[PDB]
Design a protein around this nucleic acid. Structure first.
Lengths: 238, 238, 238, 238
RNA sequence: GCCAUCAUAGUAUAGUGGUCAUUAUAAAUCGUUGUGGCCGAUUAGACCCAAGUUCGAUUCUUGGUGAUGGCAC
RNA sequence: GCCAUCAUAGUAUAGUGGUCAUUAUAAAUCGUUGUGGCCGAUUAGACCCAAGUUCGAUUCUUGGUGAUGGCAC
């Protein structure tokens, strides 16, 4: 054929072999999404259950996924160094992960929220990106990074929304109130001003969600400083 | 943060400026999908209407898409040379398209097929890839390629399914029958043995589907040899 | 063999077909190089003749190079868009261009400077990079860019070195003298203080060197605003 | 400037952090090169000494090079995983390595071969490629691969040339004689038919040349099966 | 890494130191009718990239690139 | 591209040709209770990358990388 030549312009990226692969998916414009569908704030439990359901189903479908961590609108999946899925093609992996997360999210949404049918102009969408890590210490530091981010964002949001919801403040007002404030200040604001003990908040909200292949087990725990949690799971490294 | 350093391992791909971008999305394992949901064969009208609906909605959402051509389980989107969406990041573009096509397909499926609710183990999934073309001649030759592919595949499928359904053959029998057969043989088989004139088959089935930005207009026409079709639409080149 | 598997870790990058390739080579640490070999200042004629000889030899050896422009320690090469050399493998092209430039430079140095044999710790070395340009306007703008750089640097260096040699100023003094000065001021300083008319400077020094495939002809001319120079040479475009 | 925008078309490749980098340089068309300058066959000592001298000089110039292995016209360089040279830019590294090897070879050739001045149409040129290895076992296996390749190729050329010289065979005759033969067969052919004991051949010829940072020490030894050789050198790993 | 063979239309195939350089399909237009099928007619499409030899090179000689077949890890 | 200035802990900040090299926040454990908040105490972490000079270099001299501020398209 005289038109097939265009196929030669395509460029495939084969991810470096024997390297841990992390795929992170993140919901597109989930702020506006949370606004439209009236999520409970700071954290909507059922929505996170939809996310976790999607992640668990996906992880159940692909044996190569060793570990999953997610919070808010994001989820990260660790693939074993030797994973041969789609011959380690970056494009296949990423677009497939985004498609799967989107569709699973839609399905489990139809299951958890029959009262809120999805509108065509607001559908859950996710991006996805692949990152290569040559050493497991970097994997540990990655998930540590994600959990710390969950910590910061959840604290910020809880203080913010308690200022907005429990107090009568405006989003702008609450935003300006927290400017240049650090974690300790946020907690003090929560207790003294909002009468809220952050430590008593749900373990899922503050620590995030971990899905591990053991069986697929779900935990909400600190993975940052607990070495024994990792040591007892050597198959993650292999 | 002591853990944020991992962000340095990410490698982004910014697509070459002033170049036409074609994003092709394709349904994952849609043969089995067509069997599970009992699609009409050779071509399922309503399924094709779902595809076209998803594509039209997506194209309507993003102004940078100048032209779209799709058939069967695939759809191709042409972005203007000057499209800067997401800083021309390949990962963002592809994962976003796969997610959007997946969700739009799910929605329009829920609309066209209320009788066939989607099963969790069968959801429509799509991959997506970005290909760069430096000159418009390559764009024309690309879409020409896709339409030729549509012609061949549709002819094959119509002949095949007319052999299994009409002549009451098994799929393997039709497979063996069409082994080593050429277009003339397929037309003659359809005509003489199945009593079917291919030219009278739906224009959408044999020519595929074209959605072009003019209002968004739908055509089923030959774009291969009709130069005037392209000439009359200079904004595609710009 | 049990050790060949490592070959799978190699990643080749094939440059987009039908695209103009510009390979730019630039001498590594040629300031120190020019100091070491006691180059004439502001401009050493024979060194630039070595550069030009090397470039001309390379261009003579590989027919795909349509045009070459170089000045100071750098040289840029335009490859026809349809160039299939080394299957458009980026690494092969770049490392071979740098290697060729280095060796040819060494050779022509041995010919032009027999009095100055090269020292093992100062050898001419070059880097090389490949750049893709989808439209010829970008090629024109590139060579325009390079020539403008040649003008600016030549004017600055001529004024500076005339201040150092003729006015016997120290480099730091001449440098402070030129602070906040513009082209008119530099020309005025040269003519009134140094008794030098810049307009009378060698065409090679101010305009750089252009080697174009006609037969290979060498020019020192303005290619920026002269459109007819390009128009009369359509084969550069093809 | 209105012309600087072209700089935006450049694409840099930053090699993945904390990964071992192997840069392999290989002489361009060195068969013809060896023929032109009338190299001793099967192995020319002085030329290999030029190669080794160039490599040792290069390794001496860059402290990041931990180990080098070369034979025939090829040389491989191992960079510590944490090497930051040129910010791990592939282009800079490869073009610099090819340029340096080319120039160093040119220099040492004039030292070893004053009788054979280099011809402009035959200058030593080298390509260079970068490969990333995430684990040291792959490094061990890489150098193992190169040494085995050296053994095999040396066996082939020595046997062929001995069949030509001792038995006065025609190249086609020697070629026909070696058809379907394996290493053991080649050794047996050499000893029985050509009257040459391969085991008595130069250690450089059979094992290649190893340059390791200890001081820079040169060895001709087996690194494939000797584990203690690697174990005693932990600094190679880090 | 080595030798042998080879480089032509979208694909697949014959030929030449010298006319508009073959043949078969595929492609484009017209006509007939069974439709885009079969048949008849017309049109369109190429000799890897350079140097050198020569009156003239797709040919011959050289170089560079690229591919297959063998043999060997 | 030019010049000035600068390179330390996760961040932000003092000082030295020579002891375990500051201080303030952030982080880790214990303790108090109002909670992971305030406060007390204990602990953890670093001087861009090489060479030369030197007994000894984070400091000086040189070079390479990176960043900011001014001036210029």
């Amino acid at each position: 054929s005289k038109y097939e030549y265009v196929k030669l312009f395509e460029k495939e990226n084969y991810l470096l072999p024997d390297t841990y692969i992390i795929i992170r998916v993140d919901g597109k414009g989930f702020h506006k999404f949370s606004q439209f569908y009236e999520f409970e704030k700071p954290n909507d439990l059922k929505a996170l259950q939809v996310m976790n359901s999607a992640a668990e189903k996906l992880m159940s479908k692909y044996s190569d996924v060793m570990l999953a961590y997610g919070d808010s609108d994001e989820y990260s999946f660790l693939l074993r160094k030797n994973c041969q899925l789609y011959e380690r093609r970056e494009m296949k992996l990423t677009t497939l992960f985004s498609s799967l997360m989107s569709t699973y999210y839609m399905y489990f949404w139809s299951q958890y929220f029959p009262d809120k049918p999805l509108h065509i102009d607001h559908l859950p969408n996710f991006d996805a990106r692949a990152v290569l890590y040559p050493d497991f210490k970097h994997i540990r530091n990655y998930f540590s990074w994600r959990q710390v981010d969950c910590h910061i964002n959840n604290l910020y949001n809880t203080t913010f929304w308690n200022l907005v919801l429990k107090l009568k403040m405006t989003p702008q007002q609450a935003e300006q109130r927290l400017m240049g404030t650090v974690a300790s200040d946020k907690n003090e604001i929560l207790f003294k001003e909002c009468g809220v003990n952050y430590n008593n908040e749900s373990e899922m909200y503050k620590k995030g969600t971990i899905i591990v292949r053991e069986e697929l087990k779900i935990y909400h725990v600190d993975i940052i400083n607990d070495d024994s949690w990792w040591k007892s799971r050597p198959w993650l490294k292999d």
